[PDB]
């Protein structure tokens, strides 16, 4: 098979600026390369065919270039409507193959997070599981470190986290970090804290709760 | 495909594309080296 290598996997560009995407193939694919746009939930959207020719309804904003084995997609003046995942595709050789995709992030000013912590409910304790959730709301950039402290002891490997896409109006992120303990293990400790580190905070923010605080 | 010499076949769209579209490109298709 042929490999399409896209770079960078991510790109932080503010509206009105230019974005230049790179797509490099492992074999020569002449000029038989297309580009696609895909937004969360939606299906792909064809942008370019034959390296540089646009589909119907594609603004001149998008401009494709390249030939042989190195290909490029350039967006002249970004609009909010354009931030999404961009894939390149070769159809010179079967099977058709896509790349990993480049994700356009919307650059904006720093926003510090608001932190909240949620003890496990009495309904979940009956079941036999304890989930301690720590919420980071509205913040930018994405990079953020959220550490857990049980009885002021630093934890490791017992917490999963997921983040939302950039907001439609804020362009900020919201992250959740869930500590998953068992009811037995959750009652061996008392103080449960959540330490947050972000560029928008001069020093880390910590929110905690004691088992039985309420 | 069996397109005219004034065209080239794009296998993504499975159709005959006029060579004129890419004549003004940095490198028209290797089969459109005449129309331009
Ligand atoms: C499937 O469709 C193709 C393409 O239309 C058919 O090939 C055509 O056959 C007719 C009659 O034999 C010709 O007039 C066309 O010029 C042919 N096209 C090409 C590109 O060669 C093909 O016969 C069809 N297959 C079937 C009916 O089994
Ligand atoms: Cu929010």
Numbering used by the authors:
A (entry chain L): 1 to 214
B (entry chain A): 6 to 41
Question: What did the paper state?
Answer:
Having shown promise in retarding tumor growth in mice, it was desirable to generate fully humanized J22.9-xi variants for eventual testing in MM patients.
With the resulting variant, referred to as J22.9-FNY, we also obtained diffracting crystals. Using the PTM modification D54N, we induced an N-linked glycosylation of VH CDR2 and solved the structure of this variant, J22.9-FNY, bound to BCMA. The J22.9-FNY structure also shows retention of the important binding interactions between BCMA and IgG and only minor shifts in the backbone positions of the CDR loops despite the large NAG modification of VH CDR2. Comparison with the structure of the fully humanized J22.9-H again demonstrated the retention of the BCMA:IgG binding mode despite this large substitution in the immediate vicinity. These observations thereby indicate a site for further modification of the antibody, for example, the addition of detection labels/tracers, toxins, etc., that would have certainly remained undetected in the absence of a structure.
